[PDB]
Amino acid sequence: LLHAPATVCGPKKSTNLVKNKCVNFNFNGLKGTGVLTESNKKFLPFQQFG
């Protein structure tokens, strides 16, 4: 448990996607509450949140 960010971990379990529902989303360290819908806004490939 050396003083560094670790590179060996376990696979974090996932979930199927849900549309138009108040859910407790967790997108890579994004704890919170909201609903999920599709978007027409275009990103760049190195973005992940907004």
Binding site: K42, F43, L44, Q47
Partner: protein, 50 residues
């Protein structure tokens, strides 16, 4: 070869998500007024800046 030091940049983002312009907040006082107003265009007047 150049150096990096802690200073503030006011950078704006395009509607497509990319960065098209940035302002050095400590280069010249007009840019410091642009940083304190959080806008790239200032109007005529007095701005108590720093």
């Amino acid at each position: 070869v150049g150096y990096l030091q802690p200073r503030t940049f006011l950078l704006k983002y395009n509607e497509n998500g990319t960065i098209t312009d940035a302002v050095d907040c400590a280069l010249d006082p007009l840019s410091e007024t642009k940083c304190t107003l959080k806008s790239f265009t200032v109007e005529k007047g007095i701005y108590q800046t720093s």
